From a paper:
The methylation of U1498 located in the 16S ribosomal RNA of Escherichia coli is an important modification affecting ribosomal activity. RsmE methyltransferases methylate specifically this position in a mechanism that requires an S‐adenosyl‐L‐methionine (AdoMet) molecule as cofactor. The protein comprises an N‐terminal PUA domain and a C‐terminal SPOUT domain. The latter is responsible for protein dimerization and cofactor binding.
Here we report the structure of Apo and AdoMet‐bound Lpg2936 from Legionella pneumophila at 1.5 and 2.3 Å, respectively. Comparison with similar structures suggests that Lpg2936 is an RsmE‐like enzyme that can target the equivalent of U1498 in the L. pneumophila ribosomal RNA, thereby potentially enhancing ribosomal activity during infection‐mediated effector production. The multiple copies of the enzyme found in both structures reveal a flexible conformation of the bound AdoMet ligand.
Residue numbers in the entry:
A (entry chain A): 3 to 244
B (entry chain B): 1 to 244
The structure:
């Protein structure tokens, strides 16, 4: 039967009593209605799985005893840094969930010329929190024991100037280049996915001038969220662990 | 800056200069949902890889009359014909699979009933789901540029599906003795792909699938949601043997 996986950051060790975070204790004690003696698999984000037993439960307050730890790595050797354009109507929540399932290593929300997002500092902080919770849930579900880094949103110019990945790709139709044209292999790859409206000529000159090379994915127009799934699948199959 | 032309599926054969009253469903979509006005352009397509450049000549309530200006043969189908058999699931996961598999160029889709599916659908509810799923596929072809509609097959149980499958390559997403895409001849003409429910397949089902030549495929060490698995598998298969 399926074990219960719970993300719980910290430096706890076998033998210790641990009080779960309010988020973990809400999940375990309130949502799942778990009781004394039941087993959990905690992971702290460092590719470790901790087997733990529930010692005491009071609503969201859950204390557990750490029994043992095992190194368990389900990360791809190809570390993909996805820069995903934020635009109104495009399903960023799906990208966050599925990119985590597909092993993405780092996610940067991206603001480009043709994105339609209206900037609000308070709205963005709430979205960033919701997206991080979605990523965490996806890691609980899919078995990843490291959480992808979710970086603060940046504009395209900052992203391309600062990218240090060894291969740098952008979903774009120029020259009809495919996976056959690239050596996709570890250590890493940066991937820019733009909004439905694409990139301006000036943005294309900027990305090309910083070493981003275009990647097409077939003759059919993919929704922004489908493009993320498809691009990560293709990259992981080509040079990662699919 | 350029706006992409709205695409609308209308069956039939048409000639330049003809006036077409859109079907009531398409007239509702164009006149009411999209609020399009006289003079605006549309690209109709007929499911047989023809695109009809048209303009709105008259909008009378929800009746939309369009003038066909020109016809162009345009095919955006993959040379690898994938037949996806997707196990039925709770919630609205199937609606997502219908939309995205169409975008990924799937040739044929069969809703699959297997032993470990979480759900049961009565016959009248299944008829409604099949109508809704066809409309999602048509909408996805309008969005993605396919001018041919994937075949949506009637739901069947796993034993019927494996008995009838005649595709040259037959794959099932299952971990036991799995191999990756690199170990299979993913190439035209066609491939049958079984995606089961989250709970997997019984030993007897695997005896049935393997006895009919379905070979086990893996897609990495992380457990994918069923809807993610469908779209990941289609992407990998289209890249390996199709037009990605």
């Amino acid at each position: 039967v399926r074990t219960i996986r719970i993300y719980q950051p910290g430096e706890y060790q076998p033998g210790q009593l641990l009080e779960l975070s309010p988020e973990a204790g809400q999940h375990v004690g309130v949502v799942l209605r778990m009781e004394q003696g039941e087993q959990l698999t905690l992971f702290n984000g460092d590719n470790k799985e901790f087997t733990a037993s529930i010692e005491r439960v009071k609503k969201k307050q859950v204390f557990v005893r750490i029994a043992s730890v095992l190194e368990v790595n389900r990360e791809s050797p190809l570390k993909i840094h996805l820069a995903q354009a934020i635009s109104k109507g495009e399903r960023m929540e799906m990208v966050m969930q599925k990119s985590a399932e597909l092993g993405v290593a780092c996610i940067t929300p991206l603001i480009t010329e043709r994105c339609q997002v209206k900037i609000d500092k308070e709205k963005m902080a709430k979205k960033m929190h919701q997206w991080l919770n979605i990523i965490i849930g996806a890691c609980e579900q899919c078995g990843r024991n490291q959480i992808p880094e979710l970086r603060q949103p940046v504009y395209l110019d900052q992203f391309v100037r600062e990218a240090k990945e060894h291969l740098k790709l952008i979903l774009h139709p120029a020259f009809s280049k495919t996976w056959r044209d690239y050596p996709v292999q570890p250590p890493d790859v940066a991937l820019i996915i733009g909004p439905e409206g694409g990139f301006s000529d000036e943005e294309i000159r900027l990305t090309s001038g910083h070493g981003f090379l275009p990647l097409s994915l077939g003759p059919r127009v993919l929704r922004t969220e489908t493009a993320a799934i498809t691009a990560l699948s293709v990259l992981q199959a080509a040079g990662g662990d699919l």
